[PDB]
Amino acid sequence: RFTCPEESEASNCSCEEFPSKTHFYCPDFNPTLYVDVEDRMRVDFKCYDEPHDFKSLPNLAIGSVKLLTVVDCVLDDDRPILESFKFLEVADVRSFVYNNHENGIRYNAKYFEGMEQLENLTLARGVVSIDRDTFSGFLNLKRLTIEHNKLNLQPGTFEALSNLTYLGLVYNGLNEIQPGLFDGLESLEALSLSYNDIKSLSAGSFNGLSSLRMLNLRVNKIESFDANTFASLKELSRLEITLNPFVSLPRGLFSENKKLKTLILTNNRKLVTLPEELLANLKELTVVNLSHNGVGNLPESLLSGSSGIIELNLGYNRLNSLPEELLSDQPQLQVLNLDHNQLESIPDYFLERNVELQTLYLSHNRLRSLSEKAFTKLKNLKELHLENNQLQTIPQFLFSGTPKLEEIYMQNNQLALHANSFINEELSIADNDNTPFQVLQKLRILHLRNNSISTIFQDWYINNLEMQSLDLSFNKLPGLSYTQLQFQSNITLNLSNNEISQVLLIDDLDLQPYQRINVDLNHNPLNCNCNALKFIQLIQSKAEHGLQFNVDQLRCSEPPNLLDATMDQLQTKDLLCDFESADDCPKDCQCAMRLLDHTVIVNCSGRGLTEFPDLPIPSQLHEDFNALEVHVENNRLTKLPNLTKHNEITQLYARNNSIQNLLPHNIPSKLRIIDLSQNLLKMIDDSTLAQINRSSHLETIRLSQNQWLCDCPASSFLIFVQQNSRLISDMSAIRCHPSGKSLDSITVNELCF
Amino acid sequence: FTCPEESEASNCSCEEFPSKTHFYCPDFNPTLYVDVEDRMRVDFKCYDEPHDFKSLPNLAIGSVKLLTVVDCVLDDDRPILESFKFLEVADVRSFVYNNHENGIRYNAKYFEGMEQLENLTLARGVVSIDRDTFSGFLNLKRLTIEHNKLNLQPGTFEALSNLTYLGLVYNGLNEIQPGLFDGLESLEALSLSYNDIKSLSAGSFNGLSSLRMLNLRVNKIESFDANTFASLKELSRLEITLNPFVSLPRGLFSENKKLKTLILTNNRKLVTLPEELLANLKELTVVNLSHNGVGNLPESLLSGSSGIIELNLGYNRLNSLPEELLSDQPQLQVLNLDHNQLESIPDYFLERNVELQTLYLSHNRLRSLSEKAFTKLKNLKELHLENNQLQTIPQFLFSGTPKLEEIYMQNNQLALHANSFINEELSIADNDNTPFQVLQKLRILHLRNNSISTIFQDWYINNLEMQSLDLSFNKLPGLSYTQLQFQSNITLNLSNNEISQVLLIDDLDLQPYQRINVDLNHNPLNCNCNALKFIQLIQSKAEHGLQFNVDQLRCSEPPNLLDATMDQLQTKDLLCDFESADDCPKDCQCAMRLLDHTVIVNCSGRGLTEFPDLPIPSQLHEDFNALEVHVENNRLTKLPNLTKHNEITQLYARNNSIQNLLPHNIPSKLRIIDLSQNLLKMIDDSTLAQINRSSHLETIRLSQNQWLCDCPASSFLIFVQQNSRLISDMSAIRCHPSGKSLDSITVNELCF
Ligand SMILES: *[C@@H]1O[C@H](CO)[C@@H](O[C@@H]2O[C@H](CO)[C@@H](O)[C@H](O)[C@H]2NC(C)=O)[C@H](O)[C@H]1NC(C)=O
Ligand SMILES: *[C@@H]1O[C@H](CO)[C@@H](O[C@@H]2O[C@H](CO)[C@@H](O)[C@H](O)[C@H]2NC(C)=O)[C@H](O)[C@H]1NC(C)=O
Ligand SMILES: *[C@@H]1O[C@H](CO)[C@@H](O[C@@H]2O[C@H](CO)[C@@H](O)[C@H](O)[C@H]2NC(C)=O)[C@H](O)[C@H]1NC(C)=O
Ligand SMILES: *[C@@H]1O[C@H](CO)[C@@H](O[C@@H]2O[C@H](CO)[C@@H](O)[C@H](O)[C@H]2NC(C)=O)[C@H](O)[C@H]1NC(C)=O
Ligand SMILES: *[C@@H]1O[C@H](CO)[C@@H](O)[C@H](O)[C@H]1NC(C)=O
Ligand SMILES: *[C@@H]1O[C@H](CO)[C@@H](O)[C@H](O)[C@H]1NC(C)=O
Ligand SMILES: *[C@@H]1O[C@H](CO)[C@@H](O)[C@H](O)[C@H]1NC(C)=O
Ligand SMILES: *[C@@H]1O[C@H](CO)[C@@H](O)[C@H](O)[C@H]1NC(C)=O
């Protein structure tokens, strides 16, 4: 265990012992450097300023340590690093990491006079002009990295490293690879040349490497190859060539890499063509990644014989008009990508040979219509993508041979799919439509966003039993009914941004006992007129029903009503229903009925007439409904509405009325609310008022703007007012015709005696 | 997610890994890379001139909570989002801006569009901040400014008023102006380390009320004010390290009742501590005073604080101690006094402390421990006494601590011996004074680098729970099997000792399957006959209980070549000089070997006609018996059996030539005789019978034989040849005195 050195005046370095790693700051006044030391795992030495004074240090005692990470600290000129770091006697060090920024250091064997048994090594930002003799003294060195330094390597610097395993030459900006730079690397298994400026790779560039398994040229400036560039790498298995600017690959580049397993060739822009049988006869090959290139057409024999492929990516090219038999020899192919390829159409027999194929991509192409035989023998297909195409429709037998299709994506298309699109030849054998989704019982997720869908097919809730999502946004849905909601699984049936004018529901919900059945209904020109009441009563009332509509953004589309109103702040009383089917309603009157309250409105208040308009009987059933509400406020010349007898009116409003000389014939059977404003109250008689009875329903009368004579012949009116005080809206406002003042003060004067 | 479609009229490309999608602009060379998560992060770093991202194609990436910029230059006045508009990210909840390129004078215009930002961080780029620069955020929880020289106005932070974590690290602040923290009501950390604050005024923390965990880890603080911390009623932690001040004001922490953790270390100039500095701190839990320069302490330093569970006082310059320094701390758990200059411990130091689990006293200069030092420690678990000057241990040192588990006594002047504790009072002739019998559960004990004489039997008798032990660099005289009586998986260590010899019983065994490890490396272990049992134990065996590590073992003054290895050990090399002066001649002693089981003189010497007669050195206690003859390649006067040859179990001669041999001269009591370079081939009466097949290794050899021809000896030669199978006669036999009389010669041939 390493503990802090005993405090003394000989040394000014302050050791702060932490539970994990003992810390240091040797110049106590100004800690220009700190030495974070673990027990025996690592040593972290970093300098912050120009002065070094390594000789004026307490001579720490660490002993054996695995990793020695020195950062941004100077080295003595042409002296061993362990000699320049004598103030800590690190020994038996395996890994050495040297970050250095201020000054580049020319390297020779004299800098490594203490690291004969070094396993790992790393250099960064500070190494320039490595000498050929630098690595001679090393024994059993397995890794080497030259990280972020501008460098130029003469051929032969690595000849002394026989046992080297991983070599990293990233970011060095090498201009070119001399033939024979890797002479001594006989046991090399991996190599990296990413982020360099290698102009070209000659035939003899990779001489001396035979057991190499991985290669890496991720970012270079390679303008051309040679036909025998990779011929010397018989053991190659992984190859990464990205972001290179070359125009084409030479014929037969991989003629000898029979052990190839993965080939990542992506973003190699300006790669317009691929040579004939580039990847032929590679049994071990399993993953091919040719995305983001600029290829315009693939040769037919590109993959002839490579039966071991399981993943083939070809996205983001300019690849159109695929050859028919390109994928004939790949029976293990699992994932195929063809997106962003500008494909106008694919050959009918393109995918017949692949009996097994899990996931297929065809998105972002320019497909117009899929062939019926495209998916005949894909018995293992699971995920299908067809988004962002120019599809008009789909053949009726398109999914006959893919019964295991879990998820499908058809968004951003021009699919029509009318209700009668797949109507049978008048057979009528099956109630469900003949849409191709009928055989897809395994379907789970379906997307149809941004389409021209104009219905919800019956097979989407009858045959598909495990459906759990059905996106139908931005397509021309005409309406919604309760039948189409008869799903048998938790489904988030999205229906936003459709032309859903109206929706119909029944008061009883047959939903199975489960969590919920969401229906997103945000932006629709919903008609808040008749036939929508039960939906409104459902949404506004709080209940534990399965249906959970999301109508927070939903508004109405009725100019007569409050347009742009929300249901959460909508008066359900104001729902109205026009009587368009009937023609016996009085002319020049707003004819409608409200189903919630069970009322029918005549609304002849707009016009003024000489007689009471004929009020049609509620011949329309309206669920066996027998009450009428009439507004006749403007008409004040009828002189009698005596047709009210043998009628079922329940509301009456006469803001302006003729002289109130009415007979008991006018007295109605079922009138709840009555208004007699702006009339001659003097003409009315007690016998008519006596026959008024609240037994049928509650009675409320209006005495506003009414003039009634007060005298002995007009007696008992005050008693009737007192009895009907609740009926009278303002009994005090009722006044004698000549006096114009309330008769309450003169109630004692009412009695003649 | 999906990279931009078709990459048309764009010089920047997408990688689209399954975890995150990278970007570069490699049209000529990729200067900058942008990699994004689904919604978590966006990292943006550029490595060249800013003109390379003047008009990049817009990425239109979804808004992500965390944004990062590295070494990217931006314009003088336009906001950050406007400069990086091509990213098209708006919902930012974390911003980090590393900028090594060029300092920029921040104005309030830079952060428009981030009115919901948190975890704002400005590293290495800020040079100066104008007032109300942070105004407008309206909700900020964490801020950090680091690695950049600064000089701030008092009213810079007034606008925030919701900040909880503030960090001004390595900013090179010359000093703290009063009221510079005025507007930070809800602050809860400062992290003012690595600055250059010269001193703290009384009003240096005016605007802070909900503060906790004030940090001053590295500063050039020269002095403190009396009421520096008075303005902070709530203050949980306080870290004040690596400062050049010489003393603290009296009553510095008077008003901070909530003080829970005071870390005050590495103040090399802090010569003394004020009295009752820690007074009346009930909530205090851990206090750290290590690595200071304090030389003396006041009596009332910790008065009125019973909540202390940890107290570190190590690496200081303490020379004396107060008596009641820990009177008011009955809840203490650990006490560190290591690396100080303490020469003694007060007798009444720890009567009132009972929850102490571990007590550290290493690297001090203690002369001895008082008997009642540990009298009241009912929960002591670990004890350290390393690098001290302890002479001996009192007999009742561990009387009051039965819970003790580990003990460390390295690098001490300990001189424990067999009679260092034995007293005639109540003597039981065993377990002298019981120095360690009171510790039942003593697991680990280190006595490395001491002057202990002998192993106390108490370690191997009643310390059943012992798991390890180390007696290296100690003056142990020897080892015996009786010392190995442990009842657990003990790993005893005796490396580099003065053990002359080990006496191990041949029938040593242990019933349990638990293993015992013993190391004798660098021990003299002189190799004599008694070491034969140790040699056998070291020899490879199928299974054993005492696994010996003897790779670096050496033999003291060896009879054989010096620095002999155990790989070259042999049974014959086990022979040792006998201690019986009368029994063996003074010229050379009897071998009396045990493994070899042979007795022979080491040197031939002058020689005698008759070998001396001595009793068997083994005396029936060993298989050892005389089997060899010292005389070799010498003209012996005679070889008589009565000259102890009969007493010798066997006879072995080397290049000894006898002209005449007789049956009387041949030893009958000896099982067999072996001779070489004999001058006579005649067969004696004893030679007429073949020596015993078993228990008689010595025999006759055809080689190095001289034939003698005589008619009477022909029958004896015939009898010898009948038993002989190597050859009819000697290979180098050329004798024919007018006839054939050799053993190969037939009966018909005669000597004449
Ligand atoms: C030299 O570096 C390599 C890679 O950095 C180290 O490899 C380790 O390998 C083991 C094998 O499973 C992994 O678990 C570790 O995570 C790897 N380490 C690292 C840092 O990636 C190797 O250990 C290093 N050699 C020494 C002596 O430290
Ligand atoms: C819905 O899909 C239509 C497809 O027409 C999108 O409208 C654009 O149509 C033109 C046709 O010439 C395409 O070139 C464009 O790419 C389409 N726009 C986009 C953004 O892809 C329309 O934008 C889509 N609506 C969405 C996705 O909300
Ligand atoms: C801003 O930083 C804070 C502090 O790191 C984050 O909050 C969490 O803080 C705790 C502190 O104990 C950490 O252990 C967590 O890891 C932090 N959360 C995360 C997600 O890292 C906070 O999340 C940060 N803000 C954002 C938007 O990431
Ligand atoms: C064993 O302990 C002794 C002392 O207990 C060590 O000797 C001391 O070494 C230091 C090293 O600077 C000197 O300052 C002291 O004066 C020495 N004291 C004595 C009494 O010699 C010794 O180094 C330790 N190790 C060994 C292997 O003996
Ligand atoms: C390589 O390893 C082998 C065996 O591990 C060893 O014999 C040889 O000396 C090593 N060479 C170098 C240069 O380390
Ligand atoms: C819907 O999800 C809930 C969640 O617990 C589950 O209990 C219920 O069974 C699901 N619906 C069906 C039809 O399984
Ligand atoms: C219908 O009723 C409303 C209610 O206020 C009234 O304003 C309107 O004039 C009526 N219309 C007709 C034609 O009577
Ligand atoms: C702190 O946050 C609250 C919560 O939104 C806000 O109202 C207040 O204005 C913020 N304080 C400042 C100074 O912006």
Author numbering:
A (entry chain B): 32 to 784
B (entry chain C): 33 to 784
Please, what does the article write about this entry?
By contrast unbound receptors form head-to-head homodimers that keep the juxtamembrane regions far apart in an inactive conformation. The structure of Toll5A homodimers (chains A and B) was solved at the highest overall resolutions (3.4–4.4 Å), with a head-to-head arrangement, maintaining the C-terminal juxtamembrane regions far apart. The Cα atoms of Cys-783 at the C-termini of each receptor chain are separated by 207 Å. Such a structural arrangement –if sterically possible when the receptor is expressed on the same cell– would ensure that Toll5A is locked in an inactivate state preventing TIR domain association and signalling. If receptors are situated on neighbouring cells, such an orientation might be relevant to cell adhesion. The buried surface area is about 1000 Å2. Interestingly, receptor-receptor contacts in Toll5A differ from those observed in Drosophila Toll structures, which involve the N-terminal capping region and the hinge region between LRR domains. The Toll5A homodimer interface overlaps with the Spz1C ligand binding site, which suggests a direct competition between receptor-receptor and receptor-ligand interactions. Moreover, the presence of unliganded receptor in the Toll5A-Spz1C sample suggests that ligand binding is reversible.
